[PDB]
Amino acid sequence: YSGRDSLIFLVDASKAMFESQSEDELTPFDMSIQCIQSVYISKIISSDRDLLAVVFYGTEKDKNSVNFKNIYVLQELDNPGAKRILELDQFKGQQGQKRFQDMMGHGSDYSLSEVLWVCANLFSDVQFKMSHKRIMLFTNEDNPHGNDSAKASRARTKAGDLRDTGIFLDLMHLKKPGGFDISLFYRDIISIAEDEDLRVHFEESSKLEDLLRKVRAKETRKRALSRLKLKLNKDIVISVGIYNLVQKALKPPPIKLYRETNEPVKTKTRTFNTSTGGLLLPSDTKRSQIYGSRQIILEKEETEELKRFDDPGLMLMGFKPLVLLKKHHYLRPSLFVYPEESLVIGSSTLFSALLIKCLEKEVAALCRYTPRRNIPPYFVALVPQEEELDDQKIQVTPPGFQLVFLPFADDKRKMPFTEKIMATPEQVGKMKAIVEKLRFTYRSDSFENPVLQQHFRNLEALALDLMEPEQAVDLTLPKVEAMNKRLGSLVDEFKELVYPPDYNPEG
């Protein structure tokens, strides 16, 4: 998967789309606008390098390269930004609907062939490589052309041509007074006709709920940190790739701006002599360190050369039982090692054999690891990792090796000596009861970083000039009320059984 994903939001501008079934309900047009805005915000937060477009059909005015009738391309394929969101915001309400009607109009005819032609033309203009081509149809008219059959045939032919080109088509059908029926006309235009998507739907599509669900977490495409060589010995070498399945998420780096006109500035660092005033490059100056009441002077090149031990890669040392590995010896986040057949042919077979035998014998490969040049070596353990799938066969644990760093003698710290006091069985039983009362299931994606979420919310509020920032609920805060209700009296019994009458833990 290489390139960018392009999406086009086709929104019908027919009269039937501007009628609300109930007074306290959202019109289909407003729902489509809200979905587009949500997708825009999600793309800005997650993938800012993607391309989006917004096109309307069935209007009175037109704006397109080919100069068709009743097709107004509101926004062409361009990276998302706050300006487009603000522009779309002027159609959200009823006054926005009036503004949209005045600007473009509604109630005119249209031909789906022209719409698809305009979409294809928009796709062709983009110069960047596009991994995905996608179009979404926000409409509530299952029979766009019932009076004319030639128009339907032309639309079918254009949809087929687009499908052959490699353009995905999706139908976000909206509520209809009568009921949407895909079988009428949209069975062929839509790229994939699901078996369940054949009955008459009396409610908006379920995909709108997914679209409205804002995702405020960055998405990174698969990439290899390094492509190194595993050396069983001097003459047996295979090629492996290293990946970081877990990586800390950081706020985007701040940028320095000028106060007067918000124009970015450039920061430069320089070093000058005090007694002469001249400028010194980072080669005239030396390095120093005061040991034993004396000064030791080393050049920069020598200082860098102090760290040269061995060439980059992994060197095999032996195999160790997994029992000897310790959980509390954590030093650094682990990495993932996978075969890489491009550099060396035959690496995959040996890697698979090693993984199978390591799983069978429950052993881990001890290795010496050197990520880059002029970096001191470390001792790592490659633990086999089998392929684990979930109920729906979606892979949850890939096959390969888990690279875990092992601490040196300097990475451990001595602990103060503390006398051991053992609790009586009754206290342990009461604590067991409390623990059982406070039991819950844990998942790796059950928590979110409050700082990053609040930062994203504040940034969006500032960019869109919203009245107040949206407040993010913190799921990491203990539920004091629920815990108190569940525990009941157990806390009092434990405190009576473990603490003297006058202890005052807080004090």
């Binding site: 994903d5 977490a217 729906q392 819950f440 994606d445 539920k479």
Partner: peptide, 23 residues
């Protein structure tokens, strides 16, 4: 390929974080 993220093709959709839910 059920569960694929509509917003981001090629990435598996992630369920909303539920925090702690006692049994």
């Amino acid at each position: 390929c059920p569960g694929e993220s509509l917003i981001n093709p090629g990435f598996k959709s992630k369920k909303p974080a539920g925090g702690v839910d006692f049994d």
